[PDB]
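Here we describe the complex-level prediction in full. Unlike the single-chain runs in Section 2.1, the two entities below were treated as one system.
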Amino acid sequence: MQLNPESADLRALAKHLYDSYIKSFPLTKAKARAILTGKTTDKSPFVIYDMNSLMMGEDKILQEQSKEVAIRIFQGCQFRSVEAVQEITEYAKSIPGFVNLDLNDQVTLLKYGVHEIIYTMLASLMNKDGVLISEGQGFMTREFLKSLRKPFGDFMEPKFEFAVKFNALELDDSDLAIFIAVIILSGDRPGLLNVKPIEDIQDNLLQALELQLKLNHPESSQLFAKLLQKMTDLRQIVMEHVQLLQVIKKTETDMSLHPLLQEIYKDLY
Amino acid sequence: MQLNPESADLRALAKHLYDSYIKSFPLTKAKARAILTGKTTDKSPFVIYDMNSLMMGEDKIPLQEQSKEVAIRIFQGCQFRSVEAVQEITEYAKSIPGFVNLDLNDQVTLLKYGVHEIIYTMLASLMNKDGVLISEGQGFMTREFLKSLRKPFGDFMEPKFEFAVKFNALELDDSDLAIFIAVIILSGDRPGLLNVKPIEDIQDNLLQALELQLKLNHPESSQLFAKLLQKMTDLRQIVMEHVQLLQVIKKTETDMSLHPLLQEIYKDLY
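The structure predicted for the assembly as a whole is:
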């Protein structure tokens, strides 16, 4: 490793991705950690730890029902998911060379990868106790999400399980900006014609990420390998999610989905 | 990259894994590629490209519907080998430095989730754009023939062929495969394990060994380490779509049994 024009360019590529990551995503890992440790005073979130804390929290964010509780939560998860797909698309277009690829392959790269990004970025909002909700305005506890009516008391546990392992790597927004870009640009997704120009964009991004982690994480040896193996855990989560979603469409027929999400989930896994 | 005691040890770890890989697996990539390119002069396999080539081929290896009878036998022969393969992988796993000293419940666990990932990584060595070597180089079944089989069997081999194409383009050899296989086995993030600390401790070395092997052996391929690691993603997807498909053949066909060794592996998996 040395200071040469190629290394200087890999840093330039890294800065670019970071600046566009900041421009695309409003709730950054730095921003969310600050809240999660109480370093901010403006963003003091309400904690939803039970039913009585949820009903009071709905005032900020029939006679009696617990079914309406699991329905309302799940709908709000897909409410944010749609807003998130918009940001990821805005971001994807800023990756050097993405636009100049086949548009039918741009559609493809975003179709399979959007969910992997969603969950990578969701871990930034999480801790062993719970998740930040409503752009940092609320905090829903892990155990509360777990107590929800079957089979909803299981749709968030794999994300929390992942989040714990991922967060132990101690990555920052500068590292996440390259990693997110790496995930998008993959030459092993189905329905791709031009894998050659994609694998060349990713080769640069991987070269950029390897250097970023070398400079930023002197302590973590084999982090590059560790971070790359998390893409395996992300695919499993995306797969177990669509597998769980088929149970919602079947067992509880009266549970609709947004047409933007309906197109993504169609003919996926 | 430098020559120091740690690097010398990583090479020793690499040699060890290769020598046990050779001892465990009889049909190596080198061996299979020679058959596939007609460089061997004895192992001349019979090509099964349709129905008539299969019947004549069955002479070399039920009044029911022909298309159903043929799909059933093929699918059974895929699992007959799969069993023989699990035995080889287990023999290999025991040779990885530190595997035996771990928890035996964790040893059972690691092999439970990883055996299928290895099976498919090693299956790609027997494959080319045209088909797959069957019965240890005695036969060659075509991709398109496997694709024509009665629903939903005409779909169980396509993901393996798709993978194989991408994996083989990396141009790995038995030395590289020997470390990669070992890396897959020592996966930390699997269910039913509490001793993640010693498991990760083994994989960190294996990964360090693989990074050096690819650096020395593949001077041309600059991000081969990153590329090869991303294939573990494709392997998990295949193992997942496989168990998901296996569910269909039991619900569709009541008269479709499985070997008790495989029955234990697939149980409570994905």
